[PDB]
């Protein structure tokens, strides 16, 4: 059976995503709207722009919610920029793949919206990382991961010692170990006869730092069409 | 662990012995290891890097599953593989007593000799810092084995045609590592969580990798061809 504390650092986690979520609901009418009635370069771009304002809205989220994970705060200033600079992408992926619905293939932001491949292409993205997107979505949906599974596995993304400039990458292993305990402990519980669940998992720590990757290919790939990322976005990814 | 577990287990092992045996009991042939030696030591680095990927090519084809995917999986996997699998081998021939990384006798590399050889800060101290978090873990030659049989049938690698094939391939040898390191260290349940978590790191590591040999062209200093055919 899980500990107290362990069910604590569940509920804390799984309530402060709801806490930082609030800023979804109230930022979503503020937002460039999708452009209907559009012809075959004006409703390119007015897409992308839409797209980056929603990434904005996630970046201050993951900022608010890091900051309420007990210890992050604690850590020297620098790492913990540097824990969210490399962090941001992979947990927006998260969320994109656990917002997904397969039977609409779309993916919700924000509440309300939704997006498709198509929606995607659209903004001006590259199939190089559209497809993979959808296929993490789609995998992570074959796993049917519950409120305290991605809570869990966004606090271990958080404390991941190996990304770039950490200076005291001992500190943040510390604080990500009793989260990947966690998530041992209430995988075996809800499903006791799947060993293998909870390695699938972790392995999805594995794709997202390749994802990570072919995110900031597709940046580099978006300046090429007269795309450059608006000021917030600009500093993490540029 | 099952009749099949232990023919599995035991074939990658024997297989990763012979690769070495076949590939590092002669001298290596390399450039001799001394602006002039500048352009010496990295064509040395190259051609141990090479004589590397040979012996894990010749490992790769002797890994079940693997000869039985299509040609362009087999050519996608190992393309991303490759460093990946240099990361862990590199790991496993470093010596902590030492600081070095042993090829086979007289032939030792030391944080120093990577940076004689052209290369950057940003690449070398992660490569030894992920080698010393390595033998904190201490895995054996069965682990290793299975730990780079799963890093080669990872189905979200680029250009990989037939995802689903290779998910199935993979499932059977991390259940190989999880009965065996739950029999090995049965008390330390964390053991094989730390191992995965390395996976996540090797693909960092790799794109630090594509960094270095980015950096080396700016010093005109290209990749062989057998290399380039994997990297650039
Ligand atoms: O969660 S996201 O912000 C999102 C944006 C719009 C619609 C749905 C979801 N995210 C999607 C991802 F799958 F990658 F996680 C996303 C984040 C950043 C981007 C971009 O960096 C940019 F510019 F739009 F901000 C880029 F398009 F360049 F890739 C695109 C999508
Ligand atoms: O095992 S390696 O082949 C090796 C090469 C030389 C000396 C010791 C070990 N490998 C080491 C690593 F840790 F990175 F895996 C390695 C692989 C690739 C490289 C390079 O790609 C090149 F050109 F040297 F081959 C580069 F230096 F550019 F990074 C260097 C070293």
């Keep these: 059976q899980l500990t107290a504390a362990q069910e604590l650092m569940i509920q ?12 979804s609901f109230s930022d979503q009418p503020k937002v460039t709207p999708w452009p ?19 990434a904005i809205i ?12 007990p210890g992050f705060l604690q850590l020297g200033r620098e790492d913990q920029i540097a ?8 947990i927006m992926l998260l969320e994109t793949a656990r917002r997904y619905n397969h039977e609409t293939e779309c993916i919700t932001f924000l509440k309300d919206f939704t997006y498709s491949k198509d929606d ?16 993490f979505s789609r995998a992570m949906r074959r796993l049917g991961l519950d409120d305290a599974e991605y809570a869990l596995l966004i606090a ?7 990304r770039p400039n950490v200076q005291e990458p001992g ?22 006869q799947d060993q293998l669940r909870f390695p699938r998992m972790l392995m999805k720590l594995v794709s997202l730092r390749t994802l ?8 580099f790939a978006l300046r090429l069409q007269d795309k450059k990322l608006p000021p917030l976005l600009s500093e993490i990814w540029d």
């Design 12 to 23: 804390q986690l799984v309530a402060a995503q709801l806490q930082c979520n609030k800023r």
């Design 36 to 54: 209907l009635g559009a012809d075959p370069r004006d409703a390119r771009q007015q897409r992308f722009a839409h797209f980056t304002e929603l």
């Design 58 to 69: 996630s970046v201050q989220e993951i900022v608010d919610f890091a900051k309420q994970v």
């Design 83 to 90: 824990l969210l600079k490399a962090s941001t992408i992979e």
């Design 120 to 135: 995607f292409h659209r903004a001006g993205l590259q199939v190089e990382f559209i497809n993979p997107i959808f296929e």
């Design 156 to 162: 271990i993304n958080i404390f991941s010692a190996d």
């Design 171 to 192: 500190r943040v292993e510390a604080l990500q170990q009793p989260y990947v305990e966690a998530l041992l402990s209430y995988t075996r519980i809800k499903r006791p």
């Design 212 to 219: 990570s990757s072919v995110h900031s290919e597709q940046v």
